[PDB]
């Protein structure tokens with residue numbers, strides 16, 4: 411028995427978290443109702459997009475380069491040539507928009523439905539480079555967990571090579587005791603903004619899948635995406 415809502419109220423943020431203990435098939439959560447509510451995936455979709463891009467071969471491997479088009483975008487790290495590992499690290503949207511266009515609407519829809527990702531809606535072909543940023547694609551925190559867990563047990567239609575590459579670029583933090591993988595998200599086209607941190611923790615010969623979802627009403631709220639995840643995992647004796 412642990413109060414996972416404690417971290418949320420300390421940081422003054424509204425949101426939810428869902429943690430799934432793989433070995434024990436057990437959930438821990440705060441705000442269960444929100445864990446079944448749908449939100450724009452934003453950059454968390456890069457996990458799914460990376461799998462399909464590698465599987466279809468529109469990007470050859472983790473070091474293959476896509477070049478910057480010269481347009482000055484919002485963040486300086488985005489204004490440079492990159493690969494999928496650094497684009498994942500930097501939340502480089504334009505890189506993943508190229509991947510989605512090259513996958514194409516028909517292949518994207520097939521993988522979305524085969525995987526069962528979120529609400530399964532990517533819109534019209536004209537929305538191929540923005541359906542996860544502006545809609546209509548949405549996903550619940552529970553569905554983030556289901557996707558990541560199915561991914562990890564090799565049920566999805568991706569080769570072992572594809573899985574190995576994506577699981578490697580997801581590495582966020584690593585010590586001798588644990589490997590933390592995940593991806594943040596920040597949907598800014600809705601009010602309030604929606605913050606994500608989803609992924610999974612490998613520790614103590616177990617895997618703990620997590621999905622954090624918060625309201626972002628000022629820029630200081632954004633840092634709480636990872637911090638509430640950290641405090642939640644430590645409340646369970648992890649990290």
Ligand SMILES: [Cl-]
Pocket residue numbers: 473493495496
């Ligand atoms: Cl690299």
Ligand SMILES: [Cl-]
Pocket residue numbers: 485487500501
């Ligand atoms: Cl950034």
Ligand SMILES: [Cl-]
Pocket residue numbers: 596598
């Ligand atoms: Cl932003």
